[PDB]
Amino acid sequence: GEWEIIDIGPFTQNLGKFAVDEANKIGQYGRLTFNKVIRPAMKKTIYENEGFREIKGYEYQLYVRASDKLFRADIYEDYKTRGRKLLRFNGPVPPP
Amino acid sequence: GEWEIIDIGPFTQNLGKFAVDEANKIGQYGRLTFNKVIRPAMKKTIYENEGFREIKGYEYQLYVRASDKLFRADIYEDYKTRGRKLLRFNGPVPPP
């Protein structure tokens, strides 16, 4: 799996909002309020069982500002289904 | 400062050893044993907001395996002097 830096544009911001919505359902922090995704944003492209360079899915690692704190969110996106899941929502973490 | 992905070659490994040595002088995590810097490794150029008489320095964010655990390290390197400062050394953290 190859890591790359990605932009913190609307698509990335919406992943941050998804992470905070998923973290609110888990409830470890009580109700968080999404502010913004900050740099750096990174994306890993995960390859399936090697039989074409076929794409399995993507992992995003985001720094998410919510409720005056910073969190590290790890999100998985399935290439075939386009379904997303929150892998990890941890913090507060110090800024990069 | 735009973040970029960098290699985990000898220069990166030696930044990880610097971080572990600095973290040992603090002692928050007891005496750690440097294992390896893992992917992904990231680097930002520091300007000190000017116009461009040159590069001031670099910030690195590294995942450092030490005493079989994983830690996130933030390091500053002066461009001219090559003098280094541990900004942050935290964990254990889950893999990226």
From Swiss-Prot, chains A, B:
Sites marked Blocking, abolishes the sweet taste: 41
Keywords associated with the record: Taste-modifying protein
Disulfide bonds listed in the record: none
UniProt key word Lipid biosynthesis: no
InterPro entries xrefs: Cystatin_sf, Monellin, Monellin_B, Sweet-Taste_Mod_sf
Biotechnology remark: Natural monellin has not been mass marketed to the food industry, primarily due to the challenge of large-scale purification of the protein which is relatively sensitive to heat or acid treatment.
Claim: Transmembrane is one of the keywords in the record: no
Gene3D superfamilies tied to this protein: 6.10.140.2000
Functional summary from the UniProt entry: Taste-modifying protein; intensely sweet-tasting protein.
Record's subunit section: Heterodimer of an A chain and a B chain.
Name this polypeptide is given: Monellin chain B
Organism of origin: Dioscoreophyllum cumminsii (Serendipity berry)
Higher taxonomy: Eukaryota, Viridiplantae, Streptophyta, Embryophyta, Tracheophyta
